[PDB]
Amino acid sequence: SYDFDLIIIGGGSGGLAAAKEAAKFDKKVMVLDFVTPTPLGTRWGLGGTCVNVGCIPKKLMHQAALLGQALKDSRNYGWKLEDTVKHDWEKMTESVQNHIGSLNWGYRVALREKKVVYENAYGKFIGPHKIMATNNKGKEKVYSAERFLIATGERPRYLGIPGDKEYCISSDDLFSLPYCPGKTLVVGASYVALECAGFLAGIGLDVTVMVRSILLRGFDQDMANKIGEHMEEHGIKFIRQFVPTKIEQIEAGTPGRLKVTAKSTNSEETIEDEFNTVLLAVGRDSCTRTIGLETVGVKINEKTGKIPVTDEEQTNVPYIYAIGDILEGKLELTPVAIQAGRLLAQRLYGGSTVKCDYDNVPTTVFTPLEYGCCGLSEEKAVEKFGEENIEVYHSFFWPLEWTVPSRDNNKCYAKVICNLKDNERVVGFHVLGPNAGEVTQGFAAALKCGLTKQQLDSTIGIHPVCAEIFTTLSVTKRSGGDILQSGCXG
Amino acid sequence: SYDFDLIIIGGGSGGLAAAKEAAKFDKKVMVLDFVTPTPLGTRWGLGGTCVNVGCIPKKLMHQAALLGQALKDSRNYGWKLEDTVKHDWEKMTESVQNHIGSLNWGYRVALREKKVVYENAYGKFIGPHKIMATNNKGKEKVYSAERFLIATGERPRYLGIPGDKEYCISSDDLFSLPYCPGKTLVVGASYVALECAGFLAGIGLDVTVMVRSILLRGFDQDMANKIGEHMEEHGIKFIRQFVPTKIEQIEAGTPGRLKVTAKSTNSEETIEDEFNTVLLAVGRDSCTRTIGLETVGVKINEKTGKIPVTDEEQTNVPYIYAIGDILEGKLELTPVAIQAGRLLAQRLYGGSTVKCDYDNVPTTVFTPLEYGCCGLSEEKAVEKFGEENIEVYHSFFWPLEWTVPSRDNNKCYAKVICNLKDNERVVGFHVLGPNAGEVTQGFAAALKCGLTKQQLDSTIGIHPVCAEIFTTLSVTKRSGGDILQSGCXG
Ligand SMILES: Cc1cc2nc3c(=O)[nH]c(=O)nc-3n(C[C@H](O)[C@H](O)[C@H](O)COP(=O)(O)OP(=O)(O)OC[C@H]3O[C@@H](n4cnc5c(N)ncnc54)[C@H](O)[C@@H]3O)c2cc1C
Ligand SMILES: Cc1cc2nc3c(=O)[nH]c(=O)nc-3n(C[C@H](O)[C@H](O)[C@H](O)COP(=O)(O)OP(=O)(O)OC[C@H]3O[C@@H](n4cnc5c(N)ncnc54)[C@H](O)[C@@H]3O)c2cc1C
Structure with a gap:
């Protein structure tokens, strides 16, 4: 009877993940994606926040700044560089937009090959199992589906x-x-x-x-x-x-x-x-107020705008699911939305029982000095396990690559947080240094296996690599020992 | 009837670790370190191979090369760089030697603070519990110790x-x-x-x-x-x-x-x-032929020159230990020599029982495209567990940073090797891509906790970071599926 097995509202990170996976099972799938303009009229193509106005261009511009640093460093490594290289905003954003644009078209093509109907139109529920797609010129069309996935993300x-x-x-x-x-x-x-x-x-x-x-x-x-x-x-x-x-x-x-x-x-x-x-x-606000949720009976948290959801990403209405940033009490991260979306399609059409695991999800802040972490912050570990049951091992370190440019000793810093009641289970992991993300990913995997402090210490470091610092943290915050380099020991 | 409790022969990675650790327990320790010159007359200072002629200067020159790449990449990210930057060898090696020089003095100072006697002299056993130190000008002096650690490393x-x-x-x-x-x-x-x-x-x-x-x-x-x-x-x-x-x-x-x-x-x-x-x-040869081992009865493998050792780093002669590159059937890596050295001092003077664990030690090759790995190679996993009991998950990936410079798609490659007889225990981990070492370190931690393929897949990636590829390996070698980007899916 229904027009589609699944209609996905929002073609961002989660939405497109769900679509690509559901298409594996030969179901009729439609993605609705529409980008309402900023107050100044800025628009962009398919792919969501991450692709157009988030992780991708952010990391690219981060890279542009790192390269500025690399230009200065290079002098000391023997590159005969003059005294100042000027930067050109317009050339930079042109390259960035070029890459984004090819992601926009990559997805549009991906959808086509997977036989997913893509409709560049704003979705709005009008009643049980029915949705209205208002396109760019105001033209409406009504569609029905057996199931719906709300994946509409947030806006500044x-x-x-x-x-x-x-x-x-x-x-x-x-x-x-x-x-x-x-x-x-x-x-x-x-x-x-x-x-x-x-x-x-x-x-x-x-x-x-x-x-x-x-x-x-x-x-x-x-x-x-x-x-x-x-x-x-x-x-x-x-x-x-x-x-x-x-x-x-x-x-x-x-x-x-x-x-x-x-x-x-x-x-x-x-x-x-x-x-x-x-x-x-x-901050950002969930796009859940103007998608006609009243007309299908989906409950949202009125104050925050987020959608409460079962551990299977189901709303209170059995045939309507939600994914990504709009979820109440979850995390607002691309790979989480992607995992949620993928595993959802697996549960629905692939007979899988694997739920999405939201504990100890690693994150990284791409500040000039990057910050990677996973597990609990120090304060949260103390709150959860009690002050005298926590042991914090920490240390400064100095990336080998900074020695020759001769800059920024004792800035990079690493700490692990251990639960003394649980064989010193590492319950928190924090690193401040270059490529923090690369460092953290692997350790997030180890947290999933219940890495203990003695397992950590028995792992041999790779030399000379910043990440090796974590295999040799021996000075506790409690001990009060000094943690400055250089250091220079053995 | 002893001058020192411990005499360490060789002031390299392992030697200096053992020295710094033994000194914690208020024992009389002497480090003998002498650098015999290359055929062309090259020598260097305290610190061993890694500090003077291995990891440290190698990584720093690798960094000089990466910065060359970074100069090229920067043009696309908007840095108005001209067409060619020439490199200056003499300026590079000056900076490198400068840093090395400060490590040389760092260790010389560290030993003094720790109250370890440092003797810039060639060690040679002359008889039970007795060693001869021949200094730079040929002057000899005889010393006795209760215990000795051979930590003499190798030469090209x-x-x-x-x-x-x-x-x-x-x-x-x-x-x-x-x-x-x-x-x-x-x-x-x-x-x-x-x-x-x-x-x-x-x-x-x-x-x-x-x-x-x-x-x-x-x-x-x-x-x-x-x-x-x-x-x-x-x-x-x-x-x-x-x-x-x-x-x-x-x-x-x-x-x-x-x-x-x-x-x-x-x-x-x-x-x-x-x-x-x-x-x-x-290749390199062990420095074990000319240190007078005959005179104290230490057995070496005659063909290879390596010293066989118990799991506690003990030679056949009870009071003589060996560490680092010279060990038979071990691994020839700085952090291994350091760990072995540090833990030995703990066993001897600290009442510890913790042995040095030589399984699944991560390594990294700093080839222009870096290579990190840990655990078994594919061929070794097949040999060990049988061909049809191995599942290999793999994928190419394209570092986001390379998209704007617009180079080298489908070159970086990742694979995990799983044992089908053991809940798909990840027994081998391989990555080819930028910051391979940073990526690998953490995963080596996870291998020590018996990371399984499902634990791996349940770990959420950090986006956008190369390492995240490992959280989503879904294409097996056995399946014959295509693994080329780009791609671009969900
Ligand atoms: C500046 C910035 C930097 C960030 N950095 C990172 C980072 O480094 N790593 C990381 O993991 N995350 C990062 N994030 C967060 C990440 O981008 C989001 O968590 C992720 O994109 C959320 O995915 P989603 O599918 O829930 O929403 P989105 O990806 O935003 O998808 C929403 C899509 O639905 C469209 N839409 C909305 N309503 C409708 C409707 N009614 N009908 C049709 N279409 C509709 C929207 O236009 C949008 O395309 C960053 C975000 C920002 C803003
Ligand atoms: C080019 C190169 C690159 C490398 N890259 C890496 C890397 O990236 N990562 C890594 O982990 N490892 C690397 N290694 C290997 C690593 O540096 C060595 O494994 C490590 O230094 C070995 O430690 P050691 O203490 O056993 O010996 P060494 O550090 O070599 O110490 C031996 C010391 O003993 C001295 N000595 C010898 N005989 C006597 C004597 N009779 N009396 C007094 N002194 C003596 C020697 O002069 C030397 O100073 C590299 C090696 C090379 C050559």
Whole structure:
């Protein structure tokens, strides 16, 4: 009877994963994907946040900043480089957009080969088992399905303040900005703000981060503070405990000139400065309010906008599932959405019973000095297991590659958190250093096997590689021992 | 009736570890370390092979090569770099030697602080519990100890051929070469040869590798071949199944000109070419023949020169121990020698029972495209567990960072080897790609916890990071499925 076995609302990370996997079982599948424009009119193609305005262009721009560092390092390794290489914003974003565009077309082609109907249209439920697809020109069409997957992700939140929508940009706009941002104010202090401030400084821009309260709420606060200090020592300026109150345009331009006014968080003080660009990185809102959930009876958390879901990704309505960023109490990460989507299609059409495991999922912040972790933060381990049952082994280290450029000794830092009640099970893993992500992935695998501290110590390091530090952590926070190099021992 | 509790012969990786650890227990310790010069008169300072003529300078030169690549990549990411950056050998080796020099002094200081007597002198046993230290000027002194640790390492092997000692250089000489090597022949095909051929090409030299038989004997042969093909594609020329027969000098110089003659391995064919530098990387010999082992009754394997040892690093003579490269049937790696040395001191003076675990020790080859691995090679897993009990999951991948420079798709490769008789225990782990070492270290930890294929698949990747490929290997070699990108799916 129904038009499709499965209609997927949203063609991002989770959505496309679910589609590609469901297509393996010869089912009629349709992906609806539509990108509503930013307040400034920015649009993009198929593939979701990660592909167009997230991980992909972010890491590419991170890379652009790393390369700036590599240019300086090269002098000391014998490359006869002149004194300063200038960076060119427009050339960079052109390359980035070029890659993105080929991902856009890669997916469009992938869907076609897998025989998945792709409809570039906004999905909205109209009643049980029925959905309306409104296309770009306003034309509607109604479709029915046996099952639905909500995979609509989130969008950047604005402040409630005068001028923010008309003058500020968000990450959605940053990655295809047609001109160089110039002097920038980044408002916010989580992974988006820090990563962006990070690479904008790295390519040579004057950058300021305005912080409401703490850096990286949710992450290990000592790690967060170390990332903060590093950014401060390498250019990025920080304004602590201030929130903007208005953004007014002094001059239009590409970039123009903007006057930002901010109020203290605890006092009455006021500050003004002017910038070329104000980037808002102050959280994201779930796209669940305008997809007609009332008409099919799907319950969402009204305050947060997230969708509560069974451990099988089922909503309260038996035939409607949800995946990715919109899920209540989950994690907002591409590979999680992809795994969730893939395993869902497996359970539905492949007779699998494998659920998606959301415990100890590794993450990485691509701040100038990268931060990789997995498991519990120190504070959370203490909360969960009790202060005197936790042992923290830690150490600084110095990447061999930095010795010859002769920079940044005792900045990189590694800690493992152990549960003394459980054979010193490693319940948290943290690294601050180059290629933090590469380092962390493997250790996340070991956490899944219940790695103990004596198993860790019995693993031999690879030399000379930063990651080897973890096989030799012998100094505890409790012992109070010194952990500075150099060091230079055996 | 002892001067010292422990005399360590050799102040390398293992020796210095054992010394630093033994010193924790307030024992009288002496390190003897002397560097006998290369045939060309090269020597160096405290620290052993790894510090002076191995891991450290090798990685630093590898880094010089990667930075060459980074200069090229930077153009696409918007850095207005001109067309060619020349490299300067003398400036590079100055920086490298500088760092090495500070490690030399670092250790010399570390030993002094730890109250370890350091004697820059050649050790030679003269009789039970007695050793002779011959210093640089030929002055002898006799010392006694309750225990001795032999930690003397190895030295480059030469060929049995005319001109090799007088005209060729080895790794011992390479890292402090006072002039640029120019057009180079590397003889040999294991980790030393390929690593060196690698970075010499990377800094812009004309490089030829001459191979006797196969590449990287002992490592997974398919991995070896891939490394080989990559090197061929990126400059390095290979001469297959040839062995040099003589090296004659055409002209002295810095570099001079050398005429190398080589004979086919299976036919009668002869080839001549001329080079600026011939680098011999054809194995190393244990320094165990000239340390007076006869006089104390220590048994060595006569053919190989290695010392057989109990699982506690004890020789047949109860009071004499051996560590590091000289050990029979072990592995010749810095962190192994360090661990062995550190744990030995723990057993002897710390009442520990923890032995050094030599199974599944991760290694990395720093060829231009790095190769990391841990556990068994495919062929060894088949030999050990039987062909139809092995499942190999594998995939090519394309580092996000390479997409914008737009190079080298489908070169990086990952595979895991699983035992079907043992819940698909991952028994071998192989990766070819950037930061291979960083990726591998963590997975080596997981192998110590008996990581299974399903545990692997339940671990969520970090996006976008190369290492994440391992969380999603779904195509087996047995299935015959295609594994080429791009691809681009969900
Ligand atoms: C700046 C930034 C950096 C990030 N860095 C990382 C990182 O390094 N690593 C990582 O793992 N994650 C990162 N993330 C998070 C990651 O991108 C998201 O968690 C992931 O893309 C979520 O996937 P999803 O399928 O839930 O939503 P999305 O991928 O956003 O998919 C949503 C799709 O549905 C469309 N849509 C919405 N409503 C409708 C509708 N009604 N009808 C039709 N289509 C609709 C949207 O336009 C979008 O295409 C980053 C995010 C940002 C913003
Ligand atoms: C080019 C090259 C690259 C390498 N790359 C890596 C790598 O990336 N990773 C890795 O883990 N390993 C690498 N290795 C191997 C590693 O460096 C060695 O395994 C390690 O140094 C061995 O430690 P050791 O303490 O056994 O011997 P060594 O470190 O060599 O110590 C031996 C010391 O004893 C001295 N000595 C010898 N005889 C006497 C005597 N009779 N009296 C006094 N002193 C004496 C020697 O001069 C030397 O200083 C590399 C080796 C080479 C040659």
